[PDB]
Nucleic acid binder design. Structure first.
Ligand SMILES: [Mg+2]
Lengths: 225, 468, 136, 104
RNA sequence: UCAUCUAGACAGCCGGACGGUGGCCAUGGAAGUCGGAAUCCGCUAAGGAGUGUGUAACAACUCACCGGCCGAAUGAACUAG
RNA sequence: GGGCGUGUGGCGUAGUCGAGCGCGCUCCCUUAGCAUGGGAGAGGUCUCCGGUUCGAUUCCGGACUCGUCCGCCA
């Protein structure tokens, strides 16, 4: 399933949510339908944490997540950090990042094995990503889009990239990430695919205005069947 | 509250899937619950849930389903609410609910039906004839996620008895056949999906998925009952006759080759049964489609189609075995298709591909379908060249190389020619000298235990030390 | 703001009246935006309609590309440079006035934002938070 | 008698409030099924004006499609056709008087 | 100014409200009720060649007329303080 | 703002309730030049919408458009 969901009318689910294999994060100011989608589809096996990052309802663009670790910005308060430490399982590691770009979901596009980052990140932050997430890192842009997290949706099975992407960039990124990539649109043609939707190994959640060919492209590239 | 009469349905006099006097059909236009029956419903709350289910929006449908489930969960309080009238209405809507695109809607519907059956056990017997085929269709589904919970629930409903589950197939085999026939022939993509709200694509995609699940159910029916084919031969013939099952075998388009694979399994089943041999036209049509599928396979999509290729080859070997390759005779260009396919298949390495190729070679050689020297020897050599180039860049390669060698050596054994043997030795030497991580990898070395004599290996080792 | 607001906004000290020229932060090829109107502003005699951070305004491109000049389009203020108070009581300000171009529903005409944006704007507009590099 | 039956069947679907496009798809399906009533109806339906056209055989082979108002009784629909004929006859008479003078 | 009125008036209930005759023209039909003319008898306590609803035309219902209960004034049109 | 009148082929223009000419150019013929003429062509929802008539360019009503004339203060 690519599950049709709105955040109070918003068809961008990746902005307000962060979904990994092991956990899920949702914003505190959410509707009953928005919570019920993650509660029904994810089930009781996977914890869902209602969280606020840096005083903001936006959490997907603020944080970058992995099954092994979670990265939070410097502006995240101690109460939010302690609540995430209690609510999250003991396996994941939560570490604050002290870096100027500070919006880790926009900066970092990552999965379990390999990650794409903004080219201009600091070397200490790159080593921190490689340490906490245990993930090999490449500094690359998707056809000149420096915000790889906003302009790519990535999982273990496959990836969706920006629609206006050069084909040469598509095989280059596909060989670099060792996963097949498809250029496509989400939410009735919105270009920002990573902000448009969240995905993991068995679930994808998207906006209600995402059309049927777009949803078919999602389930084909992410192998959710 | 509910108005109107299904006068056309009364004229039609067809109960469709339903054997309880209520027409049940997958298509949206007909099979909708009758207004008078809805009025007869026990409670206002039930009537409301039904209206919501009728409404198109999924969010509304889900909310209604959740409410219905809650009523079922509190069975003792709501036993009065549930009635035969409710069951008749539920059956008609349930069919539409199973066909629904949304996964949750399907999952919930199956869960709801199973819960009802457990609570109402021994009271749903009249309605079981309608319910069980639909429940079974859900249990055997192309999608694993919907099917596994449903299967587990079904077993729990039957108190974890495998025998009871097997019995169900035997008891409802005729009913299952009717359902399968309806999906395969009566249903069309347009009937399944409304034209205005759905594109030409998706409607086709949906239809293919639904029929594929029915085909999987059919395969299960044959496995469960040995005598099912004989009793319902006429029905089986019509299902096979319809081109829709054959249409499923298209490799040019489609997200997954799983549907194509399911049909291949059915064809093997037909061969084992001998049903296809018994009815010649069906067998010929299937073979022709399979040959067309080979044309559909292309280099651009080879990576997607590569896992499926070994399976196709094994099936081809069995069909090819039948009647001394009459399958090839059916198509004038069948040999050409195979040769084109071979070039496409070799370029992308696949596990089990060489084994299939050797088996096909063995089948072909009895009738000399493929010339050993003209086509096969070069093809095998090209495969080695490709493998050497891929040394072992995407291992796996190590097993694939061994698999190729074992098959190639057997292929080489059936030559009786010095030149072929020399070529094999040269290819082995070329692979060995270039090497790779193979000396380091025990598995690669162990798997390819011998391609040359032990003395020759010592001589090569001596030569390497001797070499500058 | 008005239609495309995702939630409400606390009162930020108004810093951009009508006639203000702010930098154009996105990559749409426009250099500055000239504010002619503020969405949702009230009516008082002689009072100029003023904008704050996170507000949607009507603006014209005074300097930039000729297909963007000489027409009115909606814009969103992302940097304010007049100091305002949050409910945790820090007084903060950027060093320039800056906004991006959008449609009336709020999705950005451009694709990337240079420089920081305010969290009071990023929470209120998700597309701005999507294309934003750093949110403070 | 047949026309009345056809009207009742169509009306019942309309009373249900089923989507008009959906109703039409059902009619087509019934024709494939061979339902007699379904066969009689022409496939395009002026539901918006509440008129259904049903083919009627000229001789009890060629069929002439006749529009029938759903609201009106079958006989009432017939009277309206007769009325159009009557008006046409009156017009013809006026034309006949007009022709001689007009020609001059 | 017209009418009705203890020989039972006007409101309210209840019952009948019929035959010649589907009166004559005209219409594919129109039988009291699409129209054109005439508009008369019988039985009457009383019932129009019809006041509306009414059907393709019927059928059906209701009327204005007469009757049981009520027992005494009432209805219409108009004038001006 | 108000009043009065106006609206025809690509262009100009004739119309009593029963759309013609000229110009542009379509073709053909015709030319010692300082390049003509001749013959068959195409071309309109008569500004639009309603009513009258039997039929309105024509009669009437409304709308659009254009052109004229008169209009704020101390
Ligand atoms: Mg002023």
């Amino acid at each position: 399933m690519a599950t049709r969901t709105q955040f109070e009318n918003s068809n961008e689910i990746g902005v307000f949510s962060k979904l990994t294999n092991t956990y899920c994060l949702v914003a505190v100011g959410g509707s009953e339908n928005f919570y019920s989608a993650f509660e029904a589809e994810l089930g009781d096996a996977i914890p869902i944490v209602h969280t606020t990052i840096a005083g903001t309802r936006i959490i997907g663009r603020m944080t970058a997540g992995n099954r092994r670790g979670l990265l939070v910005p410097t502006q995240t308060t101690d109460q939010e950090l302690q609540h995430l430490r209690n609510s999250l399982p003991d396996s994941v590691k939560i570490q604050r990042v002290e870096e100027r770009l500070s919006a880790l979901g926009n900066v970092i596009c990552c999965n379990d094995y390999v990650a794409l980052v903004h080219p201009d990140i600091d070397r200490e932050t790159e080593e921190l990503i490689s340490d906490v997430l245990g993930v090999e890192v490449f500094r690359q842009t998707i056809s000149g889009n420096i915000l790889v997290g906003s302009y790519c949706s990535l999982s273990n099975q496959g990836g969706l990239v920006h629609p206006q992407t050069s084909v040469q960039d598509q095989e280059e990124l596909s060989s670099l990430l060792q996963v097949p990539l498809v250029a496509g649109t989400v939410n009735r043609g919105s270009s920002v695919v990573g902000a448009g939707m969240v995905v993991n190994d068995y679930l994808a959640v998207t906006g209600l205005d995402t059309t049927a060919p777009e949803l078919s492209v999602i389930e084909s590239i992410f192998r959710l069947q | 509250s509910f108005g109107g009469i299904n006068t056309f349905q009364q004229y039609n006099t067809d109960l469709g899937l339903g054997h309880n006097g209520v027409r049940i059909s997958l298509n949206y236009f007909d099979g909708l619950p009758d207004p008078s029956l809805l009025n007869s419903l026990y409670s206002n709350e039930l009537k409301l849930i039904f209206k919501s289910l009728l409404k198109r929006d999924e969010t509304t449908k889900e909310k209604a389903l959740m409410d219905l489930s809650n009523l079922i969960s509190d069975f003792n309080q709501n036993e009065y609410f549930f009635n035969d009238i409710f069951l008749l209405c539920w059956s008609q809507i349930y069919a539409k609910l199973i066909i629904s695109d949304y996964k949750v809607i399907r999952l919930q519907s199956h869960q709801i039906t199973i819960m009802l059956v457990k609570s109402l056990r021994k009271k749903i017997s009249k309605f079981l004839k309608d319910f069980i085929p639909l429940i079974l269709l859900g249990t055997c589904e192309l999608d694993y996620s919907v099917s596994k919970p449903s299967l587990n629930e079904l077993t729990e409903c039957f108190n974890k008895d495998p025998a009871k589950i097997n019995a169900l197939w035997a008891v409802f085999q005729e009913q299952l056949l009717n359902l399968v026939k309806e999906i395969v022939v009566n249903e069309n993509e347009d009937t399944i999906s409304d034209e205005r709200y759905s594109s030409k694509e998706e409607s086709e995609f949906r239809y293919h998925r639904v029929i594929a699940s029915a085909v999987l159910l059919l395969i299960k029916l044959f496995v469960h009952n040995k005598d099912v084919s004989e009793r319902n031969s006429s029905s089986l013939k019509v299902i096979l006759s319809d081109e829709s099952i054959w249409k499923l075998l298209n490799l040019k388009n489609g997200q997954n080759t799983n549907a194509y694979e399911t049909v291949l399994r059915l064809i093997d089943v037909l061969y084992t049964r001998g049903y296809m041999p018994s009815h010649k036209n069906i067998m010929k049509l299937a073979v022709k489609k399979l040959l067309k599928s080979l044309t559909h396979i292309t280099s651009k999509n080879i990576l997607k189609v590569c896992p499926v290729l070994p399976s196709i080859l094994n099936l081809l070997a069995t069909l090819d075995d039948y009647e001394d390759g009459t399958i090839w005779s059916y198509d004038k260009s069948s040999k050409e298709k195979v040769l084109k396919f071979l070039s496409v298949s070799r370029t992308s390495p696949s596990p089990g591909f060489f084994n299939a190729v050797f088996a096909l070679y063995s089948s072909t050689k009895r009738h000399s379908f493929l010339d050993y020297y003209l086509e096969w020897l070069p093809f095998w050599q090209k495969s080695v060249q490709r493998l050497n180039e891929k040394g072992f860049s995407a291992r796996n390669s190590a097993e694939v190389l061994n698999e190729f060698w074992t098959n190639f050596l057997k292929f080489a054994e059936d030559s009786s020619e010095e030149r072929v043997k020399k070529m094999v030795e040269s290819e082995i030497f070329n692979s060995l000298s270039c090497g790779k991580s193979l000396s380091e990898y025990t598995k690669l070395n162990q798997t390819l235990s011998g391609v040359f004599p032990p003395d020759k290996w010592e001589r090569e080792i001596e030569d390497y030390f001797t070499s500058d | 703001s008005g239609n495309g607001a995702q939630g409400t906004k606390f009162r930020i000290s108004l810093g951009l009246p009508v006639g203000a020229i702010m930098n154009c932060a996105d990559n749409s090829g426009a250099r500055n935006l000239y504010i002619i109107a503020v969405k949702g502003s009230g009516s008082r005699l002689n009072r100029l309609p003023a904008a704050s951070l996170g507000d949607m305004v009507m603006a014209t491109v005074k300097k930039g590309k000729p297909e963007l000049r000489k027409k009115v389009m909606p814009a969103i203020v992302v940097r304010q440079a007049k100091s305002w108070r949050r409910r945790d009581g820090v007084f903060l300000y950027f060093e320039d006035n800056a906004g991006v171009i959008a449609n009336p529903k709020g999705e950005m005409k451009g694709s990337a934002i240079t420089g920081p944006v305010g969290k009071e704007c990023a929470d209120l507009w998700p597309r701005v938070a999507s294309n934003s590099g750093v949110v403070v | 008698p047949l026309i009345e039956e056809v009207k009742l069947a169509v009306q019942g679907l309309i009373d249900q409030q089923m989507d008009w496009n959906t109703i039409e798809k059902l009619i087509k399906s019934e024709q494939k099924k061979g339902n007699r009533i379904a066969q009689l109806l022409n496939l395009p339906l002026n539901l918006k004006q509440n008129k259904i056209s049903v083919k009627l055989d000229l001789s009890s082979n060629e069929k002439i499609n006749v529009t029938i108002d759903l609201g009106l009784s079958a006989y009432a629909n017939a009277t309206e056709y007769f009325n159009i004929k009557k008006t046409s006859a009156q017009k013809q008479k006026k034309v006949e008087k007009n022709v001689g003078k007009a020609m001059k």
